[PDB]
Symmetry: D2
Subunit: 349 residues, 4 copies
Amino acid sequence: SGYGLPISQEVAKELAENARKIAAPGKGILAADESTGTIKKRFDSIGVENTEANRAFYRDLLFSTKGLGQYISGAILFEETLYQKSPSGVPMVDLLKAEGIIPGIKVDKGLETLPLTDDEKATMGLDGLSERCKKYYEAGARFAKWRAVLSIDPAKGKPTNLSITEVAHGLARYAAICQANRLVPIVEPEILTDGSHDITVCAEVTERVLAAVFKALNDHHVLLEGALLKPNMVTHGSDCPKPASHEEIAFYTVRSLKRTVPPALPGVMFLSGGQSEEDASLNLNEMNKMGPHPFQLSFSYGRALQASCLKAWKGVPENKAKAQQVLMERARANGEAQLGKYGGGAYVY
Amino acid sequence: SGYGLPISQEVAKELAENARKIAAPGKGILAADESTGTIKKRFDSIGVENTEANRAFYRDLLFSTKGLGQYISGAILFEETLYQKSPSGVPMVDLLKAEGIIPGIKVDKGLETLPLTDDEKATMGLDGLSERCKKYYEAGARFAKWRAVLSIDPAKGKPTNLSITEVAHGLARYAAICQANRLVPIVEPEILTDGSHDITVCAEVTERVLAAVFKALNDHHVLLEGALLKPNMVTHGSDCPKPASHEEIAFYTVRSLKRTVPPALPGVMFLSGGQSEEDASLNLNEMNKMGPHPFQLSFSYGRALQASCLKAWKGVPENKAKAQQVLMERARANGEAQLGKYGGGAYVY
Amino acid sequence: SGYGLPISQEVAKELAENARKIAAPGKGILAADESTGTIKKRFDSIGVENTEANRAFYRDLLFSTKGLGQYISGAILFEETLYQKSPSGVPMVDLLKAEGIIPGIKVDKGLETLPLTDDEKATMGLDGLSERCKKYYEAGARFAKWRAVLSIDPAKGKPTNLSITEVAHGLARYAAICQANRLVPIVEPEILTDGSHDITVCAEVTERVLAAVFKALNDHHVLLEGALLKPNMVTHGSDCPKPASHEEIAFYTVRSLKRTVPPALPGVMFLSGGQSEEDASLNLNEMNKMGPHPFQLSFSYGRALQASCLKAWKGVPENKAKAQQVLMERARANGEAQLGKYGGGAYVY
Amino acid sequence: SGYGLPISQEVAKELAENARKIAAPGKGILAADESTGTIKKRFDSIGVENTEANRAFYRDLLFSTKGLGQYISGAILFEETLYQKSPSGVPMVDLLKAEGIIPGIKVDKGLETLPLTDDEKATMGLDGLSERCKKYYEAGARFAKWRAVLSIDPAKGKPTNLSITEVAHGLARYAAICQANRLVPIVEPEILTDGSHDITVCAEVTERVLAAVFKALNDHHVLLEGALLKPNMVTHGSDCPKPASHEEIAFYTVRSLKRTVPPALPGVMFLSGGQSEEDASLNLNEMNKMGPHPFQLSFSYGRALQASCLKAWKGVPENKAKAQQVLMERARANGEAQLGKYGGGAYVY
Ligand SMILES: O=C[C@H](O)COP(=O)(O)O
Ligand SMILES: O=C[C@H](O)COP(=O)(O)O
Ligand SMILES: O=C[C@H](O)COP(=O)(O)O
Ligand SMILES: O=C[C@H](O)COP(=O)(O)O
């Protein structure tokens, strides 16, 4: 009767093979999909003018790092970069392919307030998405990313039912559209750290959100075997004076996932959401000392892979090698953390 | 806590006043929002080439009909027409204002298949909708329309849960966005007549769909006082050899509405969905002999107001007067039907 | 396919005829279904020992009041009373029939905390309900009542999603079971007045609860034509120093109903929930000066019909006539209030 | 705000420890909770009169089998048996304790048709359940069982939305009540094999049902760490002429679980639902050659553990030893199957 028509075996096999390649042991994702405006903030941190040439130089600096593919399975790109050439004229996608890094593409169109909420956000982008996915696949992308955002505010009842319902609906539609176009969807429901709530509050909210997200994925006929999750870790709020221990973050994060995520999903690729480079590595490492797990626990890091790379680049060209060196140090740290083998650098029901 | 923030009293009052003006006794809506392609079919029925000049001539023929505002409270426009001038150079909106007809604007971006359904449709258009609503309000629109489509197929389980969920979600988001921009949303969940199902099947499906739609409107903080519903009448499927009597259509249609539609909604403006001009009038008339009702039962007709107008125009200019004459005959028929006073032309639980 | 099987036309007609008889103009319900324990509190207010003989005397005092049927369409009984005889040996149901008052029966089994909520309540009683309904119908009952309870506490997020979901589920199951056994279900989702919240908070919560209740009634195939609603009025919380004006209570109460209740429902029979006898009458009267309405707005009062009757009885037999006199005064007041004709005694979006 | 209050750490630890003991490697559950009537059918198969003495003899035959605890971690009892003594006067629970088998208790009150469905069933029993759980815990029970039933009928749209919603609601309420009383809930949503549908239809329906069940468990604050699932295997319908291969049943069953069941659940204890003793063992064995899994895959078998035991007993006393011998043969077979080590006896997206 009215059940989902069967997905194409050929398409399903491609999605599942690529999702498992992205969630490969000892590897994770480099998130380099900062929009034209978000990257301005980054370039401002080191005093660089946001010219197309500078963005091309920096993304070339990242993707032409020799040996990066030992630790990086995929790279999320902004649309500009997907169709960009390096200063030397090499397509960015060809830099990735030479390292065997799978290109991915951010496909949402950003955030808009839900009417009559206290500044809670819907993620836009479904219009034309299917046609965009087709073009992006032809350009070399094999996975996609769509970011939704929720916030915790006990006094205001955030996240409200409408926020959660909207986030889940947008992610499920986006995920099904991606899979119909041969792109592995990264499902990113980010619960922001804003506030002074405890780690146990983050855990409760994360559980409620993921339960809703995965029910909606099921309702929309999303193939978990060919999808990835990119959630927040479970942590104290950012206004808390003391950060939770790495063991605490690891425990509550794994618990929240095991309570809500069906194990057909091949990989959970965490966002770093403002954490320091070293915390992001140590928190992931601590989770993978608790393994083996029913899914790969790994990373999809932007700031946590690039912070020191930017401060070492400083917009100054000649120290490109130094900047690439520190990117490799962080890629190695997080690849080792995926295995629970990172040596440091720099049950509750 | 996490309830809807209060709507602006000033905005709410405008929406409610305009919704009641649109649902005025003895009046209804002229649906003239045929897209550039849908109008080609119409012009083909009488052998007219779909030039911008011909579309402008025909829409001018409609909106410059003297005295049309006695029976027509509002006119739904396609975007082209909202910003168009008549052949004589008068803005289409000024033609409407001269008759005191409120301009309205279709804001959805059409239909797209839901992945892994049997050709069941999502309605697209939320991206940029809020900004479009602002521009359309400045151009003179005071209400909007968004068409969703469902079909009945018992053997295939249509409409499936995913279809209904998607339709309701899109309509609720669209309605809340419209109201945040001072536009009265017409909520159109059209259940197609395709198939050979009985009128009682149409009634069951219509009830399930409207129950879902109105729950979602509530979830999204939509102000029913400043909204309108544009549903199918409840009828036999179009493949049935005998059409249901007008009394039967009237009974099951009113029953389906009274079982699902809260009476804060000011107006139900039916689509004609393929009915003949005379059936559309007689079916509405029969419902309003059953009055008084908790909401206005009226019309938002395209074909049922224009069919004979087109065949009388034939693309030939000079018989503009004849064509306008027959438009007035149908506008009067349906205005009188709104009052249950149309004289004809041409309990089950 | 998987839609509700059609209700029996014969059963549906009986339910709809009896629901409309209960919601008759100028009449309402006497709620006399105080359990054996709840009545102890009442008898304690005037110093009477809760013997079966005293309960029989008092219920006989109520139901043998000459002319009560001019204002009382139905009487809700506790099970004991349904099978009880007056001190003179006349069955209580025969007293009701002699006045043409329809007997009704409370069928829930009281409240139990939902695990891991802050003392939020499920209503129990579905087990054996269908068989109880059959016996109660044979004993003369023609409608039933099932009380659910919610509370407002913004700091604790009450009513929580689980509370609302449970209330709606229990009411919908109970209502469908009643109708399968030829009993009109009174659907009572009582939002308690406890707290210091504003009337606008009560309105928001009442809207959310009723939207959920009526969606669940639809999901469970409940025939609205053969059902009744018994909601709280919309008021300030009981800890507020100033009580809302009668005009304010009337406005927000009617608005909350018209925003959520489909007009196929024949009647809304308010609970008085702690209001004084005179407030209960004046608040209902004010709503029916705002008529005519899409459904009957009337009363299902316990305390608001009996408070002075008890204090006049005092457990002293001989002043049975005085007590019956004051019951008639309150029955007349509320019957007149149903018509908006009570002369007193003793738009916001 | 309105989230679940924290479960008691002491209660949670007990539930999780007992759930893991029940789901112990190489062991599973003996389902001996046949009601007084269901056992009549069994005794009739071999011509035994359903006297309390015969039931006591047979349950004693089962539970006094020497060495049974090597393969049986728990035994589900009917209430009669929980408070029964063997013919020799030993309490049934003491027989279990002597083998280290954990006693469990069936707590539902059977099935009742949902009004206006085509004979789809609600499970009754929530009324008084919490108090029953307390008494059963004092009598020695440490886990409970509640059976819901769904059927597949594509032409009738079964299982309908109402069936699934009801099943999920009843299971979630029951599970939360059990855990509040220190009993591990076995969650049994049995999809019947009735019909001629393919194994892929069973897989689709099983996925939809389990997705709904686990969302409802989350909504009701059920601790997955202290719960167990008892689902149907995924198989062809019982009217199909050819039974699916053991490899096919194993593949689709594991897939349906991994697509819907969060891995915090410690154990999935399959019902045998009419399968032969040898099929039940071989199908489980085939699943555990596919291990290791994110949860224990094991058995909760009635017929598949007792069929030959009954036919060997024949109601004749003296061959008690023979009957116990064959029970041990089947207990060993299924314990070995839990490990994927049973030697036989007697990717699709
Ligand atoms: O974490 C996800 C990405 O950083 C979001 O990028 P964006 O802010 O440009 O949408
Ligand atoms: O009934 C609604 C309108 O006729 C839909 O117009 P459209 O086909 O151009 O979207
Ligand atoms: O308002 C409803 C009834 O007064 C409830 O009676 P009860 O407390 O005995 O359940
Ligand atoms: O599979 C579960 C049990 O066999 C059900 O026992 P029952 O039929 O007595 O409820």
